[PDB]
């Protein structure tokens, strides 16, 4: 299974804070997906590797009817830490944070896991968290904040029937649920519907600490954004808080090379101090 790569031109921006803003250009510092990055192109035409979960993902769920209906997380996956199943079956999105060694290939009923334990949290939310050439595009931005899981979602249909690839356009994401259960997560495993009786392709990115300039519309939505990590035009637009810079020279940052090695040269004495004369003396002091 050779892992390919795609582009992320202007997709992967969500609402950082739950505060309404109108006609302003707010600059935020949080975990986001850098523009023009490399995202895996796993095709689900069989595939289910255990990808890492260092800090945030951009798991897309491009399907047709019911191909991708669940996700799974965890750090040990050997009945050592609590898991997080987000299965999306018919009108049930019940999340379980129990601890168990399910299997080595979670294909999908109770065939996901094989045992149970003292579950510390379980959400019972009722609303499920999920033509000619109009397919269904959907993305789910996740984070590993100690407070909540920060599950974002935004569904929208595509226009043309071009080969599978992230289209050109901007679409913010709004929070849906916030699970206050804390659990260490280092990897993740998708849960796809087998339904054997191409087809789909899920994209998986990785978030990075970046700075963004979010432009809110008059209704309260984000139309465009600029990531201050791209070509210096982006940094120039970030340092002036605008999207149409004028003609001229502008100073943005300061070039500085960071060190690469470390030198610690203490003197060659090779003689331990006689601390036994002040801590283990017969006559101590007056």
């Amino acid at each position: 299974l050779p892992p390919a790569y795609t582009n992320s031109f202007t997709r992967g921006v969500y609402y950082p804070d739950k505060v309404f803003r109108s006609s302003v250009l707010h600059s935020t510092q949080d975990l986001f997906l850098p523009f023009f990055s490399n995202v895996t192109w796993f095709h689900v035409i069989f595939d289910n590797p255990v990808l890492p979960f260092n800090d945030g993902v951009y798991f897309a769920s491009i399907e047709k009817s019911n191909i991708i209906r669940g996700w799974i997380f965890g750090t040990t996956l050997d009945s050592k830490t609590q898991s997080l199943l987000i299965v999306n079956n018919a009108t049930n999105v019940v999340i379980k944070v129990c601890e168990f060694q399910f299997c080595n290939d979670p294909f999908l009923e109770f065939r996901v896991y094989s045992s149970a334990n003292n579950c510390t949290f379980e959400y019972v939310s009722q609303p499920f968290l999920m033509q000619g050439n109009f397919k269904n595009l959907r993305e789910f931005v996740f984070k590993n904040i100690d407070g909540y899981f920060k599950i974002y979602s935004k569904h929208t249909p595509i226009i043309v029937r071009e080969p599978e690839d992230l289209p050109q356009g901007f679409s913010a994401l709004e929070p849906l649920v916030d699970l206050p259960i804390g659990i260490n997560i280092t990897r993740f495993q998708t849960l796809l519907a087998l339904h054997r009786s191409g087809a789909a392709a899920y994209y998986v990115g990785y978030l990075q600490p970046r700075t963004f300039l979010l432009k809110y519309n008059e209704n309260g939505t984000i139309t465009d954004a600029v990531d201050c990590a791209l070509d210096p035009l982006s940094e120039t637009k970030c340092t002036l808080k605008s999207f149409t810079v004028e003609k001229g020279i502008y100073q943005t940052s300061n070039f500085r090379v960071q060190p690469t090695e470390s030198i610690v040269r203490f003197p060659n004495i090779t003689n331990l101090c006689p601390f036994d004369e002040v801590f283990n003396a017969t006559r101590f002091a007056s």
Partner: peptide, 14 residues
């Protein structure tokens, strides 16, 4: 006459 979003609770300005 502002159009708040379902997730929005508060509201600020510049």
């Amino acid at each position: 006459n502002k159009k708040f979003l379902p997730f929005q609770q508060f509201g600020r300005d510049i």
